[PDB]
Amino acid sequence: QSLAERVARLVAIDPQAAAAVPDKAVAERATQQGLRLAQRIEAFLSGYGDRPALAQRAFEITKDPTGRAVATLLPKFETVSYRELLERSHAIASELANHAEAPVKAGEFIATIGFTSTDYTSLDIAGVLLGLTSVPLQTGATTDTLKAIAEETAPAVFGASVEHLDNAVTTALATPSVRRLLVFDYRQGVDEDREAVEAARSRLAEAGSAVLVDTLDEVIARGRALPRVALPPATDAGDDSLSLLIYTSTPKGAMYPERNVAQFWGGIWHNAFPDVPDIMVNFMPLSHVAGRIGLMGTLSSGGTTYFIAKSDLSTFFEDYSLARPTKLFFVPRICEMIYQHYQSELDRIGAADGSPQAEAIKTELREKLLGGRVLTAGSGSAPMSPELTAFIESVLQVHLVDGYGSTEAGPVWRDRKLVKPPVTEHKLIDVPELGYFSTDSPYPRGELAIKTQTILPGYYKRPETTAEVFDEDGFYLTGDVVAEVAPEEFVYVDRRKNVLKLSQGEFVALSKLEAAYGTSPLVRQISVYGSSQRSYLLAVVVPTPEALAKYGDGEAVKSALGDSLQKIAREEGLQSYEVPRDFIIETDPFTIENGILSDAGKTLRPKVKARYGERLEALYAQLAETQAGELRSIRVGAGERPVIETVQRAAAALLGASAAEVDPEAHFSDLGGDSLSALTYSNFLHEIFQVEVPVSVIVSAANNLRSVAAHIEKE
Ligand SMILES: Nc1ncnc2c1ncn2[C@@H]1O[C@H](COP(=O)(O)O)[C@@H](O)[C@H]1O
Structure with missing residues (x-):
């Protein structure tokens, strides 16, 4: 049944949903021609002032009977209003601009390691109000790569959540430009948090640093009693002032000028995936554009975002079941986790896939675990196997909109169809070396190239890298091979990087195989691997805990996995050479913490290579080497x-x-x-x-x- 209908029915029944319906008078004021980014934000945030904007888990400070005070989360969420969000953002900008010994002025850089939360969001806004350039850092980046980025950007202020404080300190001690360290997601009364700050200041004192440390709490309490800085900020370049850098990958900083950041705030990105009330959970770091799109889309539509309680996603179902969102944004690995839940619950009940008992598990997912108020849903950032899409669609009972896009280009398509605006022109380029041509059957293929209104101006301090991604006619080269299946309708094959040529001259799309094989019931995570010297594939598989218990981690899990991947191969119409023939079994999951997953939740091929590459090569080598050793033994005797x-x-x-x-x-x-x-x-x-x-x-x-x-x- 239609979206307009389902919304109408929700807003009759649900006063929370009714109160969160967008208000057009606010949107017209905030989006009018000429308004600078900071003024656009001020308009959304004052215009929705009384409504709930953001939500964090409530807690109480308990004592152990160790004696230590700790924050114990409750089964309940608490809201900060749009107006409270605006004040504290202004209190931060005010305190930063007016500081007596280490003030900050427009154009200067601020760097941040944090997850996503009320404080981080309010620091993002503070930065825009001050005209700073903000550089949000990856939570699983090594200290080495943090220092490398801090080197290029030379920040004056460094912000960190409590839990990343130690890596912030290390980086700040190596970065002479840093004058202040701000500590956020900090909870007064919590002994872990107090001792983290005291350790930060001892460590800096001991190294003789003059870097000042303050918690955001105190920054805001000071700012509150200060006059507001004047909008817009006195930057050098109006709408082209550099407002944000987003680091991509080696790390490169994609320049986001004010006018492209403004698109997160009620502009062109609301097309990425009638007047719908936006109530959303956010699990995505502000280090990645997907974090922003949800967070700012909802701020700019007068909705509410509910922050997930813990970095590590261990409270996922509980938070969804409390927050009961109307809109869902997923990425594959999250849909996989959901599929893994259904599947382990299916074993534990001992039911089969087509049955009423399995359909009740779905119903439970739909109504309880995900809150039962879901109106729309989208996915992006990585490819989705069709089987998983159909699974998610059956659970949610809405269409899952697929959005293809990038840090560089902004949103490029929505369910195959170019998003125009911002895309103005496109084409496919042949890629002879990877065997992709516009004459291919059944469909033309090649690299997608585009001209778009949201294209980045360039990579920060990297003119050569910037020239590599445009062709002679100024089209941006996406790096992405696609298939045109109808006039201006595309489907993704893979990144150019992810396409491997096997030794017998067959071409594999590695990320496409991982998506396909990720719906094996035995598979928790998979990374597929190839070498151009070899005629077959390997894989690094984290099996599910159940597979481990049942099969172990030796030949029996490999053999079982083999059958499972064969069956997908046959069902999906993949070739025999597209099925891995052997495995490295890993019992410890890829995480953001480990460096194997990016902040978006993607499996990072070069990080798999660096960790497992040697073991994988030794596994390729051993097959023919044992046979050769034996032939030699036989010749000799x-x-x-x-x-x-x-x-x-x-x-x-x-x-x-x-x-x-x-x-x-x-x-x-x-x-x-x-x-x-x-x-x-x-x-x-x-x-x-x-x-x-x-x-x-x-x-x-x-x-x-x-x-x-x-x-x-x-x-
Ligand atoms: N909807 C999607 N389906 C398949 N792949 C995607 C999709 N969106 C993004 N990607 C991939 O993710 C890349 C974006 O990388 P990033 O710059 O880190 O966001 C794209 O160039 C694609 O390779």
Whole structure:
């Protein structure tokens, strides 16, 4: 049933939903021609002033009976109003501009490590009100890459949530431009939080740093009693002032000028995925554009965002079931987690996939776990297997809009269809080297190139890298191979990076195989791997906890996995060479913490390579190396052993048989051996015994391994 209808029905029943319906008078004021970014924000936030804007889990400070005070979360959320959000943002800008010994002025850089929360959001806004350039850093970046980014940007202020404070300190000690360290998501009364700050200031004192440390609490309490800074900020370049850098990947900073940041705030990104009330959960760091799109789309539509309680997603279902969102934004790995929930719940009940009992599990997901108020849903940032899409769609009972886009280009398509605006022109470029051409069947393929109104001005302090991503006609080269399936309708194949050429000249799209194989019930996470010297694929598989218990982590989980991936291969119409033949089994999941997952939740190929690459190569190497060691052992001992043993071992080794299935009565034909492999075998035998053995003596169904051993001995 239609969206207008489902909304109308919700807003009759649900006063919370009714109060969150967008107000057009506010949107017209905030979006009018000429208004600078900071003024656009001020208009949304004052215009919706009384409404609930943001929500965090309520808590109480408990004592252990250790004695220590700690924050104990409650099954309840608490809201900060749009007006309260605006005040505290202004209190931050005011205190930062007016500081007595280390003030900050428009144009200066601020860097931040944090998750996503009320404080982080209010610091983002403070930055725009001050005209700062903000550089939000990846929560799982190593300290080395944090220092490298702090080097390029030279920030004057460094902000960090309590839990990243230690890595912030390390980075600030290596970064002479940093004058202040601000500490946020800080809770007065919590002993962990107080001792983190005291450790930060001892560490800085001990190294003799003059870097000042303050919590955001205190910054705001000071700012509150100060006059507001004047809008818009006195930057150098109006709408082209550099407002944000988003780091992408080696890390490059994509420049977001004020006019492109403004698109998050009620501009072109609301097309990315009637007057719908926006109530959303946010699980995505502000380090990544997906965090922003939800967060600012909802701020700018007068809705409410509910922040997930813990960085590590361990409170996911509880928060969704309390917050009961109207809009869902997913990424594949989140849909996979949902699918993994359904599937382990399916084992535990002992029900099959098509059944009423399984449909109740879905119903539970839809009504309880996800809150039962879902009106729309979208996904993006990585490719979704069609099976998973249909699963999510059946659970939610809405269409899952697919949005393709990038940090660089902004939103590019929505359910295959170019989003115009901002896209003005496009084309496909052939990629001969990866075997992709506009003449291909059944569809034209190649690299998508675009001209778009939201294209980045460039990468920060990287003019050469900036020139690499445009072709001679000024089209942006997405790096992404696509398939045109109808006029101006595209489907994603893969990044150019992710396409591998196997040694027999077949081309694989690696990220597409991971999406496909991620709906194996045995698979928790998968990374597929290739080498151009090899004719088959490997994979790094984290099996599910259930698979581990049932099969272990040795040959039996590999063999089970194999069957499972074969079955997807056949069902999806993939080739035999697209199925991995062996595995590295990992019992410890890829995480953001580990460096294997990005802040968006994507599996990072080069981080898999750096960790597992050696073990994977050694696994490619060992197959032929064992066989070669055996052939050499047999060559070396043959002038002193029963000719029949030689014949058997040679046959076993060459074809891939266990000694068990090599009987002296077996036919070379039985053990997998065509007449091409019989010539290799004849040559081997000729080399060690000095006697001629025709390929007739091996392939003839008259003969068997005694027959062969017989022939040789008669000479
Ligand atoms: N909806 C989507 N489907 C498939 N791949 C996607 C989608 N959105 C983004 N991507 C991939 O993610 C990249 C964006 O990377 P980033 O710059 O980190 O956001 C794109 O260039 C694609 O390779």
